[PDB]
RNA sequence: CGUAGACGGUGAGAGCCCGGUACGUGAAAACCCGACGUCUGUCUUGAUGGUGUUCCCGAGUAGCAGCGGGCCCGUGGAAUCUGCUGUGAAUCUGCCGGGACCACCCGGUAAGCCUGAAUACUUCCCAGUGACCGAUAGCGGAUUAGUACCGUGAGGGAAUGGUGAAAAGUACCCCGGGAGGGGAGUGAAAGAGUACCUGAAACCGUGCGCUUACAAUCCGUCAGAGCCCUCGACGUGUCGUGGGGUGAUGGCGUGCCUUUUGAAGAAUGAGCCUGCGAGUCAGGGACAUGUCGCGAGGUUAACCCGGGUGGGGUAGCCGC
RNA sequence: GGCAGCCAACGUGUUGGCUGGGUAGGGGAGCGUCCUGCAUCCGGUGAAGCCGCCGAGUGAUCGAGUGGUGGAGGGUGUGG
């Protein structure tokens, strides 16, 4: 039986070229009007994982 | 360049067969060795080792007995694990114990164990093991005694060959084989290794061509 | 089975080694013959009395037809130009035994 | 010689298997899971995080599409080159792949800015602007087939 | 000398004692696949390769709509396939598909069609194999076994192997109603007696040694008086580097396990012994830690061949 | 006096000196059992098992020491 990927977690992270886990930033989907622009371009972009959710994230992306 | 003189069952001797180096010159690893033996005897392993669960016991579908008032402990079934005759809880199940060497490493091996005969003088060449086209265990044993005395000889010797594998065969240390299936394992176990002049030339080409 | 009863046999293994004697019995369901004067067994048996030495059935492979020469021989077989039978024949001196 | 009684595994090869539960001088009683809870009696899930929206769940799915219909290219660098071929002459896909420096059944893409010294007619797929530049300076031809 | 040391049996490890094994080989009859026959439709009775304009040629189907099914596709932009309901196309300038459509196009010619062998499985039969079990195991079932027994019934469902090489299975006598014994005999051995290989523990005695009826004991442990045997100075019982027990008496001493902040705990479990009873296996699964091969390469999967574990197999995968 | 990591040494690195209560738990190293490849030994002149004696090891435990019973297998080494 293949180790099967989560889904959920591949299609919220990905790797870099030196394997940085990286991931999109929340409270940027909507309700942005009250949002100032700084606080959207600090959730612009992407983020490495933390240390913390490294293992985790990188258990539900292998398999 | 390791040399083997051809031998001749007549008692005479006829020319003598290059060892390659890359063949019977090779430093023995005994680990890979050791490796590619354990692989080569857990291929042979035959695991039809069997037992049955709880679930494949006959019978226990029902419950025992109540949940509670019995004053006894609680079954869920008459073939759970620790009530005698009950299923066997990680038993053996039939499996397939081959592993997927590498083919460098298994050929590798092979030749590091050749090597290791070379290098000792325990390979022999031999242009066949009895003379004529009837078997006799009787001749291929005069002829093997005087090629080596020691206890066990792989006879590696070509498919047509079957009058020598016949005649030698028999004998209780001789293992035959063919130098398509030549192996570590063989080589090893054998303390001589004795060629018929076909199956090294044979050998040699489809390892070195 | 090679031995049958009527024929001497040398008894080549057991107390009795090297003992002649008669087959009195083939036990062919057990592979094991009846000899005369071999495998004596004291008996008590009611009758009274007290023992009677009678013979204990031994294995046929402790024993081989005796050849013509007498001397024990393994039985092979040699088929018949007349009837087409099959006559048992000694391997030592290969006569009808 | 050797024999196969002589065969033994590498030294820090074999290792023996932590047999659990067999007394309290090794890894007895609860087998290294401590007292009750559900992890003394099973594994907790890779995606549970305690009801809590999971981080897989909370964080936006990343932005986009796949593209199935996108013309991925096997990169060759004119270093390599250079290393493949000392000494010029033509190169193309089969003998990318034969010096290992492509996939066998691929479009080929050459590039590179690792100073080509090397006179070399290369025919891939495509070609950067590096490439050509380096291929012409190193006084070779680049061709697109 | 064995072209036959496979495996068993035989009074204990047998290639040469036996069944056999490698291999001299064998079928009347019956049933399975081969060659030649009788037997079975189509032609020479102008087609057969070229010529050329025009007419005719597979339906309640395709399509569409509604509601569903199934596809990675959970109705979604929803294609292809399909059930039911309704409505319903011509003849190649046709029709269908390429996940709309002019179509540049390409592919194919459904519905009237139908029809082939080459891959899964084992009740049963034959020959084999096992780093499988070995009588609480292995099939429930080595034994009356789907039996006994239980249940109205569906159904549930056991326990029970070993004398000895050979019954040679203890004649005869004695005690005893017998049972069971004691002589005697058989046997290598009855320390093998149809309650039978070995014969553990629990448990139950009998004999001997020490101890114990003024004593408050988690039953032990540390001292320890007093009561027998192994070598000797000495010549004879008191010593010893010595060597086991039994324990008057003194000190200390709150079972084990689980679970708890914490249990000797008056919290849980255990009457005892023996046997069994719980991190195991599958997968190029995933993540981390010694070895082959590289030199940027490693590998093969299915599969093919080999009487094996061996040789091929580049598809793919991972690096790049 | 006896046993368990680091340091110095000059040379083969095994000697000396600085070191250790433990539940969950982690790491390391081992004892015993069975089955096995190969090697090699013991065994009806008595294997295993069982009951002891005498001892032994830091532990699991040991017994190619030994007595009794026993009757056919078993030990050791290195691997799986």
């Keep these: ?58 258990k539900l992306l292998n398999g | 360049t390791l040399k083997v003189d ?13 060892l390659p180096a890359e063949l019977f010159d090779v430093e023995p690893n005994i ?56 299923g066997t809880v990680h038993g053996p199940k039939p499996r397939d114990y081959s592993q997927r060497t590498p083919k460098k490493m298994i050929a590798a091996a092979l030749r590091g164990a050749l090597s290791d ?40 010797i070509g498919r047509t060959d079957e009058v020598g594998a016949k005649s030698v065969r028999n ?37 070195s061509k | 089975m090679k031995v049958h009863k009527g024929d001497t046999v040398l008894v080549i293994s057991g107390k009795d080694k090297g003992a002649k004697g008669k087959v009195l019995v083939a036990y062919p369901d057990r592979n094991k013959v009846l000899v005369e004067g ?35 021989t393994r039985v092979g077989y040699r088929i018949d130009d007349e009837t087409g039978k099959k006559v048992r024949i000694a391997k030592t001196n290969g006569k009808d035994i | 010689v050797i024999k196969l009684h002589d065969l033994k595994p590498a030294p820090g090869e074999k290792k023996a298997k932590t047999r659990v539960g067999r007394g309290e001088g090794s890894k007895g ?30 964080l936006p799915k990343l932005k986009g599409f796949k593209n199935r219909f996108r013309t991925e290219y096997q990169v060759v660098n004119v270093g390599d080159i250079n290393k493949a071929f000392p000494q010029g002459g033509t190169v193309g896909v089969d003998e990318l792949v034969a010096k290992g420096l492509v996939r066998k059944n691929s479009l080929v893409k050459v590039l590179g800015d690792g100073k080509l010294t090397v006179k070399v007619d290369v025919t891939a797929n495509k070609f950067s602007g590096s490439a050509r530049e380096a291929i012409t300076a190193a006084g070779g031809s680049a061709t697109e087939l």
């Design chain 2, 6 to 18: 051809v031998k001749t069952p007549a008692g005479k001797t006829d020319g003598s067969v290059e």
């Design chain 1, 1 to 58: 039986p293949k180790a099967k990927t989560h889904s959920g977690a591949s299609k919220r992270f990905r790797r870099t070229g030196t394997g940085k886990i990286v991931r999109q930033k929340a409270n940027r989907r909507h309700l942005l009007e009250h949002k100032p622009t700084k606080r959207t371009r600090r959730l612009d972009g992407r983020t490495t994982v933390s240390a913390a959710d490294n293992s985790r994230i990188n």
């Design chain 2, 171 to 207: 004998l209780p240390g001789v293992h035959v084989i063919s130098p398509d299936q030549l192996n570590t394992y063989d080589v090893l176990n054998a303390d001589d290794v004795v060629f018929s002049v076909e199956a090294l030339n044979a050998y040699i080409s489809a390892n």
């Design chain 4, 29 to 58: 009683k609860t087998a290294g899971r401590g007292t009750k809870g559900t992890k003394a009696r099973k594994n907790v899930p890779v995606m549970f995080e305690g009801g809590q929206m999971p981080i897989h769940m909370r």
């Design chain 3, 38 to 72: 071999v495998n004596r067994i004291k008996k008590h048996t009611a009758v009274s009395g007290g023992i009677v030495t009678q013979e204990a059935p031994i294995h046929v492979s402790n024993v081989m037809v005796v050849d013509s020469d007498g001397k024990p």
């Design chain 2, 117 to 156: 005969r070379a290098r000792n003088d325990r390979i022999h060449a031999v242009t066949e093991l009895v003379e004529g086209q009837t078997p006799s265990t009787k001749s291929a044993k005069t002829f093997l005694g005087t090629l080596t005395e020691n206890k066990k000889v792989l006879v590696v």
């Design chain 2, 31 to 86: 680990a890979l060795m050791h490796q590619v033996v354990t692989a080569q005897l857990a291929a042979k392993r035959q695991g039809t080792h069997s037992t049955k669960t709880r679930g494949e016991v006959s019978g226990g579908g029902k419950k025992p007995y109540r949940q509670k008032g019995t004053g006894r402990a609680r079954q869920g079934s008459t073939r759970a694990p620790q009530f005698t005759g009950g």
